[model samples]
Target: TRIALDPFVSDLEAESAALRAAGPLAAVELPGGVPVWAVTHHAEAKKLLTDPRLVKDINVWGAWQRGEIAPDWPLIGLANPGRSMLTVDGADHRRMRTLVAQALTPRRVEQMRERITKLTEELLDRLTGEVVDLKADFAYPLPMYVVADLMGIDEARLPRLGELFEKFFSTQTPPAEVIATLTELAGIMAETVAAKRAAPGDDLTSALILASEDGDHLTDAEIVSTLQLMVAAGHETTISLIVNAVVNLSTHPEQRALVLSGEADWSSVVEETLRYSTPTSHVLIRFATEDVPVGDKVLPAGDALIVSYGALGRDEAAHGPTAGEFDITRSTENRHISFGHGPHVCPGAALSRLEAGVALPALYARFPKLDLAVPAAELRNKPVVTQNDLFELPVRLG
Candidate 1:
């Protein structure tokens, strides 16, 4: 059976359940009428992510060869966002990835704990005991500042970047505006690259440019794309992580008590949140070079496959029958691949975990009586198929 992945605004949980029930490799039809396969089982999802036959090159896509994919397709930015490590594989992937990875090393990310703590404290100070959308006012700005500190981009340019990203990550972006958004997004990154070129700093942007100038042969477009990808991925996923954990703990009273009473730790809350409601629901656009077997199905040559993180994270085969239930103390050992695995694993994984680890406990201690300002059922998901994000998180801070 096949599932349509469009119009999945508030129905992700329901749809993820359907994908899991459909067997290991489920048929998924993406927006703009493109066909793909989603690996809904944990074991198979892990194997395919490392499979040599599946690659990141857009040129290998049969639909693109036939000109079926429009230049302004809503997901065009993802499928063909030029010159970034995401669109390449093997040595090129390693080269670009390694350059950025060195900076986000666990030791380096840990060093920022002091800064993350200060930011959270200052942000929490701004929120009164009134009704507030924690997502917009708090969840949004914290990670944005952390990531900006890494990229050396100033706050004056942040709001516009956030606007472009909301359009970029969502399927709701109109076909007419898709390419234009992408162009402007890259243009903004180019300006940052230009600034770093004239006056260097101890920042990722400077490191990428200098590394290219020294030996990497990285093009202007590639540097711009890499910086653009960092800004987008670095903050967006963590924003959702912070917001999702708040919603989960607020609704699950016993779990919240366990955490608050020190019967459970904030780390458990972070891990289970990653497993239960991953920030990213579906990652895009990897194509098959040859037929590959996935369970009882064959992923035909030239077809696209998207790793279904939301579905597989709760697959009974991986986490047993209680997978769907949110349990913070389920296991100290995490088995989820929500940050991805293999060559394309998220470089920012440690950073995101650290951000959430520091933020969650501090958030709870700051407002022990924090809760949903409205019924839990009234919270809404944005129309972005890729991100598991809420439109706003209305909460009462006491």
Candidate 2:
């Protein structure tokens, strides 16, 4: 199926161009025989994402539960479908978001800036030699450990969480691995929650465990589910974005000089990176609650649709002619749906931005002469849940 063939597709840029030229919407069938409307136009994609009728819940389709899907496509959930934030809409969505939003607010994340900066330096300190895969040595581990520390979980014992998450979400394999991961993560969450309940720490996990302070806002199961989702959504996406941002800067010298010069605003750099080379191309699947019209196209009731944040970044109409161009100076005023939109916008976005704000500058500063050890053509792009490298980016620090 086309989904399985994504890894072999050497010309994604050309393929995206072909799809973009065709129009705002295209009907494509997945390997599992489920058909979906792929919305590519910037305006229509945003409209579809924000529309209440296009619900983020995919249980309406039952594709994932039947084992006919992959991770990061329609997000995998416990068979019950209500455990995670991805399946809810309206009041449920608002309630769940309100409970977890405090952990990821910009002000709260900014307060942790010193901690993130310290972590970045610690990782850089370990990179004593010349040649290194920055991804392995720095980008990936830093965020993973940061998320782990914040959740009050053991980062070392759970190294397999990363590999398992990657395999479980991969379309190349059967859905059995993802199911296994869910089962395993549930046990892990249960243990962590019980410990946190016994003794609190100054972490998100502790905050959630102590939600009784505000009248028992979260249940034990909700806490477990939230922790599981954070590992996938909060941690992995931030790691990928940081890795890709560095890769882009290495390949593009003019941009690098500008950034190093400090004339380039780092915030704008984060926005452009989110738009130009998005960490997540597709969102957790959204289903049509009722008939919805998006850019002259109508998704019938019960039909499923995916909004591409990746495509919206390049939408010329929304961003003007230079929309596709990577411009750090360009105003990021045009909203890119990188963190999603409306109710389901990423709750951990501030934490993600904070991690990047420290990590990216530190990466470039430590290795000013860093360059890709492998040629651009040789670099393998991860086509699974998110776009990333299989092996961390190989480069010379000097």
Candidate 3:
């Protein structure tokens, strides 16, 4: 059955349930009538993420290879846009991924704990009144600042970066605006790289530039692309993580009480939020190199596939019958692939977790009576299919 996947899903959970009911690997149509297979089950998605036959190379997609994909397509940037590690596979993927992996190692991320804590506290202290847009004042800026500091980005450039990203991820961005946004994002990254080159600093961007000079063979294009990928992926996911965790905690009073009373650790709340309301709904555009069987459906060779992490998180088979429910008391060992699975698993997973772990408890401790300003059902998600982000999260810090 061909399903017209609505870009602006009014109810994300309901839509996810519909996708799951369609089957493990369901045939669906993306915005602009692009046909692809969506893996909606946890086991199938995990297997496909690691399968060599299903690759990240967009060239492997017959439609893209045949020039059917327009450069101005709303989702073009995410689908076949660049040559970063996110687009390549095998040795090439390894080479690009290695540099980032080394810098984001668990030890390196751990060292940032104190810094993250301090940032969270400072942000919390800035709140002036009982009512606030928690997403704007706290959840958003904390990760943005952390990522900018990590990459040595000038604080002055953040506003432009935020505007560009809002357009970049939105399915509602008009075709003309799509091209313009991509051009502006590239120019910003190029300038950032040039600025970093003139004066080295104790930051990831400088480290990458120095590595290139030391014969790592990273091209100027690759360096810029990698930096863009890092900033976008690093901050956006963590922002959603923090916001979603707050939404869950506020909506579930008993669970929030457990967390606030020290009966359960903040880490549990973070993990459950990752599983129950995954930050990334659908990762764009992986091509099938050959005929691949997903359940009873055979994904034709050269077709595209998108792993629906949003659906996988609540798969009854994966999380039992109560998968739809949010329960922080669920085993910490609960196998959730929300960060993704296998070779392409998110490198910043630990960091995002660290940020939320630091932010949530501190947030609750500061405002013990924090609660949603609006009913949970009234909160609206942004028109972006890839990100599980809300337009705003209003709250009362009672």
Candidate 4:
């Protein structure tokens, strides 16, 4: 009943089709021959995402407990990624999430619109040529700058952070390099926290530190881990969202024309892209605390589960027969769990949306003639299982 799942390389659409063929709940093998269940169908995925029996607690993972999960596993950092909101469940999940939620409230994210727009303008103005790697030049930096400013990350450390993250998200990272990457990331976060403590600023990191000191009992480790999570998640996914939207629009000229001519909204472009090309593919390992029925299969206690967002986004049962087609004019009612569903849903969803909403229209408006430098088929995806990321997005701003 188990199908080979390549944790290293992914042909997203093909893989999604395979998951669907295997049914709503399918047994799949991770890179190391580790077995897990995947929730592929959208409706089932939505239901299971909130089920208390399926917990984020890594301790419930028998493989890790038995030391079968190696420290050098490319996704080990993600699967067993320290004590953060992402790894906890129940009251603890609420505790960690509440702090971040309060800071990233809808009002707070809305307040960031002006700043995001200004930053987008600055980035666009700096593009000095007809050709640009939109992913590198535009998509990548916009979210990084936005999140860095929000978290008070030092500009000097941005390059280093980027390098570490590249390794962190890559399946090709060597064993020795994996540990080193994690260590370096932790060291950088620790230093950032220390700096914030010395001189509290009007930033999220400073706020977190102050909150920790003011009876939250948040440990230094927790603060550093939370900061690392924020910086990594806040920007990386948003970068992909912007890049993917551009890729979709550039390829779908009819849709692009509609948006350009004011016939369709940019928000539609963003939402459709989110559904068609979800930023995150498969969210790394969550464990079943008890028997959890998924479709006809029962995920036994201690089994690992991955919500295959890549498959769920395109589920015909959920989105109709035309689900696979990229249609910007698709109903706004087309709900997607791309940012996830339930209590564990991403808090930075609004911020990511805001950045894309600002950056996409501005990019297209500034460069109406922007088109892919190479054919869509020639563009490649990075071998990162968690992120639906591209290696580069070459485009000509004609």
**C-alpha TM-score for every candidate:** 0.97, 0.89, 0.97, 0.97
Superposition error at 240 for model 2 (Å): 1.3
RMSD of each: 1.3, 3.1, 1.3, 1.3
Candidate 1 clashing pairs, residues 3+ apart or interchain: none
**lDDT (Cα, 0-100) at 340 in candidate 2:** 75
Q: Output the worst ten-in-a-row residue range by lDDT, candidate 1.
A: 326-335
Strongest candidate by lDDT: 3
Candidate 3 error regions (>4 Å): 332-334
Cand. 4 Cα-lDDT:
0.87
* lDDT tens digits, residue span 252-334, model 1: 99999999999998888999999999998888879999999998899999888888899988887788778998899785234
Poorest 10 consecutive residues by lDDT, candidate 3: 326-335
Q: Give Cα-based local distance difference scores for all models.
A: 0.87, 0.70, 0.88, 0.87
Badly placed stretches (over 4 Å) of model 4 are 7-10, 332-334
Model 2's lDDT to the true fold? 0.70
Tens-place lDDT digits, model 4, residues 1-83 = 67676664557778878888887998888766778889989889888988988898888988878989888887777777778
**Residue 374, model 1, lDDT:** 87
Predicted candidate 2 versus true structure: per-residue lDDT over 36-55, tens digit per residue: 77676776776777787887
lDDT of 2 at 109: 78
Number of clashes recorded per candidate: 0, 0, 0, 0
